[PDB]
């Protein structure tokens, strides 16, 4: 594999290049990063796929200037890391803010864009329930990280993979929360949750498109995810029985979603 930057304006846009095969374009969600959000599942996709990971702004080492952030400047990262790989045309992945990505991208460059999939997916924050969640994350990452931390375990993982994990476990993955995200850098990426409409451009998409809703999600209800679907024509809908990081809790449900939606003729 190797890790690579590509300059995008003001930033440094960091991307891994893992496999052989047709491009698989990872866009990960709010605190997450290409490591966090996709490492495990590299080696059931890098035979499959050449799949490129991009760090857009606000994770992992990318750099850029801390400007607010614009969901058009965080599609040309995503974009630009793709070109850069030599993977076109794509199938994109987005999980969360990063489906938001995903829905701009496959607007506004459908010339690079084959098939996209959707995970834990919405349009805006507008509904009351996301405007006061993530005003609540805001708040918590300026005043007491330890919570937020603690809240994103509770509300992002269903209730029976947490008890899985047990004491130890669970520990872990609170101090992974506390210690690996890059805090400045998630609190610029939930103002975009709170401000970004990708409506408009759902409208103009004319791709494959699948929505995948997660059935006990308390960060991104799967009402929004259908709502997605209704806006996009064609997209079809499916739904994992778990949280809202379904790709840590079912990582082999969703590669085979992956693989069915996107290795089929």
């Not at 890391?81 to 992945?93: C, G, I, Q, T, Y």
């Not at 460059?109 to 999939?117: A, E, G, S």
């Not at 103002?191 to 997660?214: F, H, N, Q, Y």
């Amino acid at each position: 594999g190797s890790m690579n930057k590509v300059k995008v304006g003001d930033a440094q846009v960091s991307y891994c290049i893992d496999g052989k095969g047709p491009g698989l374009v990872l866009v990960h969600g709010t605190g997450g990063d290409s490591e966090t959000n996709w490492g495990h599942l590299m080696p059931a996709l890098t035979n499959d796929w050449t799949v490129v990971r991009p760090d857009y702004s606000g994770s992992g080492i990318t750099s850029d200037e801390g400007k607010q952030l614009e969901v058009k400047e965080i599609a040309a990262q995503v974009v630009a890391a793709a070109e850069a790989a030599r993977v076109v045309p794509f199938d994109l992945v987005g999980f969360a803010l990063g489906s938001a990505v995903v829905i701009a991208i496959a607007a506004d460059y459908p010339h690079l864009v084959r098939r996209i999939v959707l995970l834990g997916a919405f349009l805006s924050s507008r509904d009351i329930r996301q405007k006061t969640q993530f005003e609540l994350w805001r708040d918590l990452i300026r005043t007491d990280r330890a919570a937020l931390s603690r809240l994103i375990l509770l509300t992002g993982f269903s209730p029976d993979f947490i008890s899985k994990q047990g004491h130890d476990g669970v520990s872990v993955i609170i101090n992974s929360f506390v210690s690996e995200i890059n805090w400045e850098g998630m609190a610029r990426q939930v103002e975009l949750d709170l401000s970004i409409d990708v409506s408009e451009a759902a409208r103009r998409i004319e791709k494959p498109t699948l929505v995948i809703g997660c059935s006990h999600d308390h960060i991104v209800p799967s009402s929004q995810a259908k709502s997605v679907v209704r806006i996009i024509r064609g997209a079809q809908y499916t739904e994992l029985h778990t949280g809202h990081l379904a790709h840590i809790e079912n990582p082999e449900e969703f590669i085979l979603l992956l693989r069915s939606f996107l290795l089929s003729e």
